[PDB]
Amino acid sequence: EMEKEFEQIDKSGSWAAIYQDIRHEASDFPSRVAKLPKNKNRNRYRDVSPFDHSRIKLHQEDNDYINASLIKMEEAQRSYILTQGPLPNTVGHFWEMVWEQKSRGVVMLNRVMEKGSLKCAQYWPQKEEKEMIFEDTNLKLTLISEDIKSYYTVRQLELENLTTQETREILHFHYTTWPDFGVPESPASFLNFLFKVRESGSLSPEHGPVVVHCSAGIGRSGTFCLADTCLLLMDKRKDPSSVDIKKVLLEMRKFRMGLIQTADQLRFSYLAVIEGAKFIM
Ligand SMILES: Cc1cc(C)nc(Nc2ccc(N)cc2)n1
Numbered sequence: 276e277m278e279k280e281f282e283q284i285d286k287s288g289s290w291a292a293i294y295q296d297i298r299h300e301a302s303d304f305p306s307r308v309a310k311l312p313k314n315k316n317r318n319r320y321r322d323v324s325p326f327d328h329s330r331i332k333l334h335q336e337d338n339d340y341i342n343a344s345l346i347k348m349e350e351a352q353r354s355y356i357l358t359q360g361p362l363p364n365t366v367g368h369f370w371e372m373v374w375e376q377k378s379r380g381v382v383m384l385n386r387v388m389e390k391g392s393l394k395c396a397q398y399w400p401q402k403e404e405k406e407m408i409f410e411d412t413n414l415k416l417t418l419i420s421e422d423i424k425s426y427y428t429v430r431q432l433e434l435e436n437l438t439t440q441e442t443r444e445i446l447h448f449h450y451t452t453w454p455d456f457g458v459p460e461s462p463a464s465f466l467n468f469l470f471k472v473r474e475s476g477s478l479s480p481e482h483g484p485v486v487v488h489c490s491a492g493i494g495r496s497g498t499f500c501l502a503d504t505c506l507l508l509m510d511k512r513k514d515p516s517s518v519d520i521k522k523v524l525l526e527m528r529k530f531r532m533g534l535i536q537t538a539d540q541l542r543f544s545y546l547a548v549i550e551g552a553k554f555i556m
Pocket of ligand 1 (some may be wrong): 408410
């Protein structure tokens with residue numbers, strides 16, 4: 276059981292050591308499309324690339340490339356699209372992907388500015404009356420409502436395909452209190468946030484996969500998917516303590532490189548799953 280394994284690694288201070296075995300054991304697959312010169316300005320970080328096998332393709336004939344990966348968790352019956360915070364020049368691609376994949380939710384785990392630098396383009400409208408048009412992808416986005424709480428904000432958005440005049444409601448879940456350095460002290464507000472996303476239906480098989488991002492789409496985004504999948508496997512299995520976090524992380528790393536960036540994020544993931552299990556048993 277992970278609670279005992281937690282105390283062991285903690286009392287022995289072996290988090291860097293565990294984290295390094297995961298690094299060593301992690302899959303490495305080609306990411307050739309990401310490295311084409313014509314895609315250089317579609318990537319926020321040159322060392323964070325989707326694998327060719329799991330990459331989301333835009334349905335535009337010109338250039339189908341976005342920095343985004345489909346993570347398919349077969350046993351949990353859960354999919355996620357992990358992506359980078361959009362760039363000024365990829366905001367239109369981002370909303371095209373949301374449209375094409377029939378996503379119901381967008382989960383944002385960063386602030387637009389952290390440590391005095393921009394981590395993300397402002398890719399949604401700030402006021403009801405000031406809608407955004409993406410000319411390149413022929414999409415209109417409107418803020419319908421905004422519910423600001425202490426730890427997160429939920430926004431209702433309307434996405435309109437200007438080509439076909441179809442419209443969809445998208446939910447934007449924005450966790451606003453992840454600290455600039457390190458991880459939250461307690462996983463309570465993160466778990467609350469996760470249960471809120473679940474309650475919306477955004478993670479449900481009726482809909483396309485949820486879009487999850489932070490700045491690179493590997494660190495905080497990683498913790499979100501790892502926690503959700505581990506808690507769901509604990510509901511589903513005859514023996515809940517058969518769930519090995521490290522195994523689940525390695526399975527997710529076949530789909531996108533670098534998920535969980537630090538030993539601190541790994542420790543936090545254990546804590547999130549351990550605490551979430553109480554509210555599930
Ligand atoms: C109608 C309207 C008015 C304004 C000021 N912007 C937009 N669209 C937009 C496109 C690309 C980026 N990066 C950001 C915004 N659309």
